[PDB]
Amino acid sequence: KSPLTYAEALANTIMNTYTVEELPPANRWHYHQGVFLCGVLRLWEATGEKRYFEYAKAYADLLIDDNGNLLFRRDELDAIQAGLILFPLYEQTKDERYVKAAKRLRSLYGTLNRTSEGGFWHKDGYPYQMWLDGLYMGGPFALKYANLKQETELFDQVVLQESLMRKHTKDAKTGLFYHAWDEAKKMPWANEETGCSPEFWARSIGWYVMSLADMIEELPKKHPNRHVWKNTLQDMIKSICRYQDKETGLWYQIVDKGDRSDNWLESSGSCLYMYAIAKGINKGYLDRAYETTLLKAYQGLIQHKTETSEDGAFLVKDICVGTSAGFYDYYVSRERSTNDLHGAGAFILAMTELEPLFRSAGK
């Protein structure tokens, strides 16, 4: 019943399903494995069990050679996220290969194309488009690197990226943020007046709040954004919680339209909100009163989205598959998969932040 118990169950299930050579997308450096392994490494910190560290290291060593060389999608913010595992790996081994690989990813920021105000294109293939997911793919990594190599320019970078995303995607009415924004207004989903996509897609907003919750502590003491990001998180969380499902305690694929019969409760976004809420409470960014919302979500998640197979495998269902920016019908039609890596990583990370609150509840 304790959060870490489920975290270990899911982690072991995935590690048993895939060797590091099979972890999907097989033999590719990507954020799917990056987020799952960030969870596995967070679990290693919590449990002290070596197998978790070793597995993550094995994936890193499969892709990074003796000289720190790495093959990856050179135009994607998506390629940067996995770099997050390089910091704990380096801290533990002091093996420079990880620092060298980190530098290759950090050097990408100067090569990527940008919107007129400086916002990174999500990919070369998505010209002038900023997707909320990108804040998590490239924000946290930048701050970790800034602190490792004392490169303060990276603080200004993330501050700019976040300010631009918030400026263009935040909906004043609901407080939620639209999935994407196209400065060129060329994509079919771009609102002719605002340039924003039409829906509030759960996971994307989840990556945004996870990012704010994790990045505040990486800033220098007294930095202006310690207050800005805390306030932004508080408002986003308040907005998100207004849409929590009363019955299950979970959230819908399309956040504000839970009454539509073609909508459904999605697991990865729900877990990301759980993580941000738990993290926010633990660090003091959010009032402890959110604990009830958090525990309700936890109960519903386990009760409605998890189960153990007849073979002993721990399964987390209804995780939305990889998804792009689009329209309502597109979002609700997305395949609902079991144990997809981004969702598995979100689940594990959420359990590690929840554990503390779970154990001190009532005190």
- β partners of residue 319: 337
Distance CA 93, CA 95 (A): 5
Dihedral angle, C-alpha 95, 96, 97, 98, nearest 10 °: 80
Q: Which of 337, 260, 281, 270 has the alpha carbon at shortest distance from 303? A: 270
Q: Binding site for substrate, residues?
A: 30-31, 78, 122-126, 203-207, 323-324
Measured from the Cβ of residue 216, the count of other Cβ atoms closer than 10 Å reads 22
Contacts 24+ apart (CB under 8 A), 53-59: 53/92, 55/15, 55/20, 56/85, 56/89, 57/89, 57/93, 58/20, 59/20, 59/23, 59/33, 59/85
Cα separations in angstroms, 22 against 31, 69, 336: 15, 20, 21
Q: Rg of the chain over CA atoms, in angstroms?
A: 19
Architecture of domain 1-363: Alpha/alpha barrel (1.50)
Q: Binding site, residues?
A: 30-31, 78, 122-126, 203-207, 323-324
Distance CA 332, CA 47 (A): 37
Q: What share of the chain is helix, strand, coil (3-state, %, to 5)?
A: 55, 5, 35
Q: Which of 3, 174, 149, 166 has the alpha carbon at shortest distance from 83? A: 149
Q: Which amino acid is at 120?
A: F
- The structure was resolved experimentally with X-ray
Note the resolution in Å, 1 decimal. Answer: 1.6
Q: Give residue limits of the domains in the chain.
A: 1-363
Distance CA 202, CA 331 (A): 10
What is the DSSP annotation of 235-299? Answer: HHHHHHHTTS-TTTS--BSBTT-TTSTT--B-HHHHHHHHHHHHHHHHHTSS-GGGHHHHHHHHH
Q: Which of 274, 253, 272 has the alpha carbon at shortest distance from 336? A: 253
SS3 of 164-185: HHHHHHECCCCCCECCEEECCC
* Residues 6+ away with beta carbon under 8 Å from 350: 3, 271, 272, 274, 275, 278
Residue pointed to by tokens 């897609």: 201
Catalytic residue ranges: 133
- β partners of residue 355: none
Dihedrals phi, psi of 314, to nearest 5 degrees: -90, 120
Measured from the Cβ of residue 292, the count of other Cβ atoms closer than 10 Å reads 11
Specify whether the CB–CB gap between 267 and 345 falls below 8 A.
no
Q: Which amino acid is at 361?
A: A
Kindly state the tokens that stand for 312: 């002993």
Measured from the Cβ of residue 69, the count of other Cβ atoms closer than 10 Å reads 12
Cα separations in angstroms, 47 against 24, 108, 127, 241, 358: 25, 34, 43, 30, 16
Distance CA 143, CA 34 (A): 17
Kindly state the tokens that stand for 192: 């002719």
Distance CA 29, CA 159 (A): 26
